[PDB]
Amino acid sequence: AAYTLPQLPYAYDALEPHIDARTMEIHHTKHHQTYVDNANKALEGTEFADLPVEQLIQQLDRVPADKKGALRNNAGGHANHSMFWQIMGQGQGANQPSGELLDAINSAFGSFDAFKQKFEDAAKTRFGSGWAWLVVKDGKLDVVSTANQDNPLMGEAIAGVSGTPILGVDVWEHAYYLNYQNRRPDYLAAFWNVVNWDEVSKRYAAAK
Amino acid sequence: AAYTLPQLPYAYDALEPHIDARTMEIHHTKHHQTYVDNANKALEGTEFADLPVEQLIQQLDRVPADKKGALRNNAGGHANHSMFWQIMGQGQGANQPSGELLDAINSAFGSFDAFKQKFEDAAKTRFGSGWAWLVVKDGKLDVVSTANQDNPLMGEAIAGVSGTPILGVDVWEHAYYLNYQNRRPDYLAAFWNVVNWDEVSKRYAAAKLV
Ligand SMILES: [Mn+2]
Numbered sequence: 001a002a003y004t005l006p007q008l009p010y011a012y013d014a015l016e017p018h019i020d021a022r023t024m025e026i027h028h029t030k031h032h033q034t035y036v037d038n039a040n041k042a043l044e045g046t047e048f049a050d051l052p053v054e055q056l057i058q059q060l061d062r063v064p065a066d067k068k069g070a071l072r073n074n075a076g077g078h079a080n081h082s083m084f085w086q087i088m089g090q091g092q093g094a095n096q097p098s099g100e101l102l103d104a105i106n107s108a109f110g111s112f113d114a115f116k117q118k119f120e121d122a123a124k125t126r127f128g129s130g131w132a133w134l135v136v137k138d139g140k141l142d143v144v145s146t147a148n149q150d151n152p153l154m155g156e157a158i159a160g161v162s163g164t165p166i167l168g169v170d171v172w173e174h175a176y177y178l179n180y181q182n183r184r185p186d187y188l189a190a191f192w193n194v195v196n197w198d199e200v201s202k203r204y205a206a207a208k
Numbered sequence: 209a210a211y212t213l214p215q216l217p218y219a220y221d222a223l224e225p226h227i228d229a230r231t232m233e234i235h236h237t238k239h240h241q242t243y244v245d246n247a248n249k250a251l252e253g254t255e256f257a258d259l260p261v262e263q264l265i266q267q268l269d270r271v272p273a274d275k276k277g278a279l280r281n282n283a284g285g286h287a288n289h290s291m292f293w294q295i296m297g298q299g300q301g302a303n304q305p306s307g308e309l310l311d312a313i314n315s316a317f318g319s320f321d322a323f324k325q326k327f328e329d330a331a332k333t334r335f336g337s338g339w340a341w342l343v344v345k346d347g348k349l350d351v352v353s354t355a356n357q358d359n360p361l362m363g364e365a366i367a368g369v370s371g372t373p374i375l376g377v378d379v380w381e382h383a384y385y386l387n388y389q390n391r392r393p394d395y396l397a398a399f400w401n402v403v404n405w406d407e408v409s410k411r412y413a414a415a416k417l418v
């Protein structure tokens with residue numbers, strides 16, 4: 001079918017203690033796997049099966065109406081997670097961006113420290129399941145969030161927000177409950193340790 | 209302030225193995241506590257602080273607009289969880305209802321087994337955080353679900369569904385991840401073991417009053 005589960009760029013325990021191996025394993029091999037399987041089933045009937053996922057989710061307006069929900073959720077699931085594994089890494093940096101990106105950040109947010117707050121807040125104040133994102137939007141950076149597996153690539157009409165994600169954090173409870181339980185903020189603070197800013201800079205460039 | 213955290217009807221470990229003690233504890237003393245605290249902060253400015261929570265959530269259309277979301281989420285949170293603790297119990301029944309309620313269930317769903325499937329599916333197919341409910345609606349029972357801390361008492365306009373809940377299961381991942389991780393269906397199947405059907409009957413009776 002269209003989609004398969006990407007292999008991770010690192011081992012299930014590469015991100016310890018920030019994220020636990022068990023969680024990485026379940027998250028990847030079950031949660032992501034299902035988004036993939038279920039998207040594949042949706043794409044069954046359709047003209048859309050050979051599209052790149054990140055293209056597919058920009059065309060939910062074009063797909064069969066009675067598939068739209070299923071694809072939004074599961075194609076969304078797949079796109080969101082495929083990104084997430086790639087913007088994390090072992091042994092990064094204290095870790096921060098530099099270059100064109102650090103400059104972008106400074107202009108849009110004031111500083112990296114300021115950006116980190118604005119990001120953590122979008123993430124904290126996201127109620128129920130969702131994601132928080134750093135997007136490029138008209139060449140300028142902004143921070144935003146989405147419900148469930150919604151992505152800014154799906155446009156304002158569908159996701160409530162818009163822009164191109166270059167960084168995202170899963171704040172579905174499955175992403176952090178085993179290690180941090182209710183302590184979402186503890187999870188968010190640990191996150192910064194494992195961001196791969198090389199990859200995020202990589203995408204700043206593209207998205208420009 | 210308006211609200212406080214209710215005490216549970218049973219010990220944190222009363223529902224083992226179906227739900228683990230640690231989860232009950234965090235679920236009650238953190239998750240619910242926050243819904244209570246946050247609701248109290250919202251109610252601060254307002255004419256609505258002395259309402260019963262289950263009345264308050266039926267008047268979100270009446271409250272200040274800029275408080276509406278905070279209250280839907282947090283008063284919702286508080287109402288949902290206050291109910292949830294009360295419809296579970298230790299050492300129930302194989303556990304099932306009887307009386308006026310078993311009849312009601314038979315007429316609306318065909319049988320208890322059938323009802324359990326309809327309920328398990330509403331719960332399973334609920335995407336992201338939310339709840340599954342057994343509601344009374346025009347005297348007839350139905351099964352429905354809601355996003356996040358939405359409750360059918362908020363009406364169709366806000367919750368997407370309507371009716372009076374007499375049973376609900378939390379399918380926020382916080383409710384089951386420690387014990388079941390991704391296995392929501394395993395969680396749902398265990399739940400039937402700790403339903404208190406006496407309390408659910410009790411509500412059927414009340415909710416029948418128009
Ligand atoms: Mn996830």
Ligand SMILES: [Mn+2]
Binds near residue numbers: 235289380382
């Ligand atoms: Mn809960």
